[PDB]
Amino acid sequence: SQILSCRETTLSMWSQRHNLRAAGLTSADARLVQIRGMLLSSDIFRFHRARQETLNLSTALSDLIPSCESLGLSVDAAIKMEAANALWDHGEMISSIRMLQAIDKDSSLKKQSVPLSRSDLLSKIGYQVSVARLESPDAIQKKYLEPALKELKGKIEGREAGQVFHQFAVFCDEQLQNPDSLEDLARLQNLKKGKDEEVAQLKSHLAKAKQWQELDQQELRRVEQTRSEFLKLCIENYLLSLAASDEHDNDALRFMALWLEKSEEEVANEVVKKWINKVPTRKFALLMNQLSSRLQDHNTLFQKLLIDLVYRICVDHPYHGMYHIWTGARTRVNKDDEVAVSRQRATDKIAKALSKNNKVSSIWPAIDQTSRVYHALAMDRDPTRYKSGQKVPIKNSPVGQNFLSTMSNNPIPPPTLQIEVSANLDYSHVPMIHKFAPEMAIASGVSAPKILTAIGTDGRKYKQLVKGGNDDLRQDAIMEQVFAAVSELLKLHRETRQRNLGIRTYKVLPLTSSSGLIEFVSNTIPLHEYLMPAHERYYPKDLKGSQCRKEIANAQTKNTETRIAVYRRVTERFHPVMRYFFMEYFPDPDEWFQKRTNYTRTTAAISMLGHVLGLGDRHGHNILLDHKTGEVVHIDLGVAFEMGRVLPVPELVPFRLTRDIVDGMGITKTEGVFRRCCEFTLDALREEAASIQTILDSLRHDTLYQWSISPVRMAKLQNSEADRAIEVVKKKLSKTLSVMATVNDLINQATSVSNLAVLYSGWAAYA
Ligand SMILES: Nc1ncnc2c1ncn2[C@@H]1O[C@H](COP(=O)(O)OP(=O)(O)OP(O)(O)=S)[C@@H](O)[C@H]1O
Ligand SMILES: [Mg+2]
């Protein structure tokens, strides 16, 4: 505000003082720059939601119109549009609409400086008239949206056309999913059914009955034809908006859901056939879990479009599609006939075509051979050759030496390195695997997870878990992708973006239905592995972690009164020590404070986002403490959507807020940074409930995502389902209660002793 106010004084004084200016700078030039600077200062002030400063600017701009008309300037339209924006941002919807309509009626938007296209004005009126319900959605399309597309004059590229096409597609989409229109179609459908049943009873009575029946049919044809036109315009404009600009890129997720719902309706497939080849494939690159799950060999038109799109994605962005094709052709999910012929065979045909073309031919074989040795190394468990906790050189097994040789002959980027999508299609700047460190660690389990290290070409170390056995990493990979998408939504609001509220991601890469390649997050330490030694180092007279766990597990088959009494007796001899994490890794006070502040913000963000998505299984081994930045990282995100309160001893807390987590906050225990960041996160989440619905809808058309926790993992954890889950998520984002009251309720039930006392003992709540 300080810089922008001083810049306003500067530009006005310079426009007033004629003797200070240079020779060839007339007063029209100084005025025009001044106006442009004011317009620039109004966009910035609108983002910050500073109402009084947009009001000041738009008033001071409107006062410059008389002086500007005498200098020979035509700046009425842009200045009146700035006034209309100030009105609309203060709540005057009708006054803003009337003002924009006046600009459009009597003004010459062509012959005037500070240009103003007529199609962005028309679409602006159309949007504001739809929000205010000022006209029926059949006149909005006839007066404002179709004239806009006609003013584009055949231009189908740029941000102007991008705005117009997204405007029109969102409009038509909104007209399809209309509760009134769906009720009317249902009413006409029941009418048709009942009248046909009545005609079936009787077979001038029949004559009039069948005349009424025919008129019902004509009405129903009219309604369905209206809905079909809306569908064509919706899909076509979504595709044209993706091909024009990059402002609207979650239109790829919405087009994809809309197209997989109408896979049979041949009119959608014709429109998609016509317009699909103009979208850059970098828009669909992150949707390969949903695209490769619908692959089938059926010879329809939907499949001839879907296979060609998947093929082009894997050719343009191979490190984003190749592993999905390999997994699809090397993961025999079952020998039984449960459609996977079509999925498993079609992926095999794409793989065969990939190893035939010139762009990707030094890349597919590399990924082929390397994945084969990674999977072989994963599956190889020997209790003698691999002892849990040791550090074995990977040259003594035959698997290890075949792995080393194969990886030396075939250079690829590290499989667990997160590669950003390249608009120019250049993946040469990506570090390849140079060599492997000679040894590999081993963790405790049955099928020993082995931690490899890879030294890349740029000289960095990429550690990896090579996880084998009887787990499902596709659950964890899908949920990691959903959490990353929602955290990307948080960047669009001023309060969460000012605080960098978001989550830390990692990379899960499923190779087969029994193995995968997890990224070992660089310089973290599990929360339980810090807290259990620290509790005995700082309080040598307290109980140990194992004595608390056993004491809590013994009273697991008793009445809630005895469980709560045992829990109070434990935690009276167990004091939190999480505050020492910030005093021994960061002894400098101005680093200590920034690290402690980052921990609170990263904890608050994942607490609210993990409540909205039902995230469970938040014990100490799934939470990592990054001791370079202080932030927390949540891994193992597969038990979501409330699958955790179905377990034998349910997890009935919204998130993890035990006494340690809270102790690592400070001396204002949960008030202050934690409570304010919970409220900013939850406030920005329930203003993006449409986008979160889109993301979960894309999840609904994923054949392979399981919405219940299979007893295999349910026994590994404690020693329509889509419609219910998405409905619960949708009612956690309801604006009925305020954010302050919602957060107060969550923090009450997350720290309650009667809730923490009846949790599973492996969920270390005493800690
Ligand atoms: N991506 C990762 N980055 C860093 N550390 C990880 C990562 N994945 C797992 N770990 C840690 O490495 C170990 C992996 O163990 P897991 O098999 O996930 O669970 P566990 O603690 O070994 O036993 P359970 O089944 O979780 S009770 C734990 O100490 C985790 O904290
Ligand atoms: Mg784990």
PDB file of C-alpha atoms in Angstrom, residues 3 76 142 178 188 200 202 293 392 436 439 464 466 479 504 520 534 570 659 713 739:
ATOM      1  CA  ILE A   3       4.648   1.755  -2.572  1.00  0.00           C
ATOM      2  CA  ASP A  76     -14.161   6.528 -20.758  1.00  0.00           C
ATOM      3  CA  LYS A 142     -28.767 -15.323 -26.467  1.00  0.00           C
ATOM      4  CA  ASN A 178     -29.409 -28.165 -12.691  1.00  0.00           C
ATOM      5  CA  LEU A 188     -41.531 -36.311 -17.566  1.00  0.00           C
ATOM      6  CA  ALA A 200     -50.504 -51.582 -21.456  1.00  0.00           C
ATOM      7  CA  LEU A 202     -56.118 -51.268 -21.929  1.00  0.00           C
ATOM      8  CA  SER A 293      -7.605 -47.463 -15.880  1.00  0.00           C
ATOM      9  CA  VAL A 392      24.493 -55.072   3.365  1.00  0.00           C
ATOM     10  CA  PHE A 436      24.535 -46.682  -6.834  1.00  0.00           C
ATOM     11  CA  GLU A 439      25.541 -50.679   0.344  1.00  0.00           C
ATOM     12  CA  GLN A 464      14.616 -45.098  -2.329  1.00  0.00           C
ATOM     13  CA  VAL A 466      12.235 -50.792  -2.656  1.00  0.00           C
ATOM     14  CA  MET A 479      -4.303 -40.415  -2.336  1.00  0.00           C
ATOM     15  CA  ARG A 504       4.900 -31.556   1.595  1.00  0.00           C
ATOM     16  CA  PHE A 520      12.859 -41.671   0.894  1.00  0.00           C
ATOM     17  CA  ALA A 534      14.014 -38.139  24.053  1.00  0.00           C
ATOM     18  CA  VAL A 570      -0.043 -43.331  32.448  1.00  0.00           C
ATOM     19  CA  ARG A 659       0.342 -33.712  24.056  1.00  0.00           C
ATOM     20  CA  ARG A 713      -4.674 -54.491   5.264  1.00  0.00           C
ATOM     21  CA  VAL A 739     -15.190 -21.531  10.848  1.00  0.00           C
TER      22      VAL A 739
END
